């Protein structure tokens, strides 16, 4: 399973089971460019969020109701949607994944 494999290898579920996590299959340069695209408010009300002009290939990884450490279980949902990321620093780079529309 891509999600079980990737989450593990990325040290994401090595010491616990992360309930949800999205993976972006676009280049890093192209994802970093979103920080200068459409400004929107994060779900929390913050406004340092940016929505990508176009849709991007992403894979949603969600734990199943049965999942329990050490045996984490994820459902793999591949899709193409706009991504919304929060940006900070200098340069202005993504630091959080807010959502995918």
């Amino acid at each position: 399973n891509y999600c079980n494999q990737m989450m593990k290898s990325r040290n994401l579920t090595k010491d616990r089971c992360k309930p949800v996590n999205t993976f972006v299959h676009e280049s890093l340069a192209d994802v970093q460019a979103v920080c200068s695209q459409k400004n929107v408010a994060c779900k929390n009300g913050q406004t340092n969020c940016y929505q990508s002009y176009s849709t991007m290939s992403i894979t949603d990884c969600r734990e199943t109701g049965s999942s329990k450490y050490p045996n984490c279980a994820y459902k793999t949902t591949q899709a193409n949607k706009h991504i919304i990321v929060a940006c900070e620093g200098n340069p202005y780079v993504p630091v959080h994944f807010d959502a995918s529309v």
Binding site: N21, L28, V85, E88
Partner: peptide, 15 residues
């Protein structure tokens, strides 16, 4: 060691 931008890359990037 790991910064917020670095953490985002490791957790969400898979070009």
């Amino acid at each position: 060691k790991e910064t917020a931008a670095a953490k985002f890359e490791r957790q969400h990037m898979d070009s």
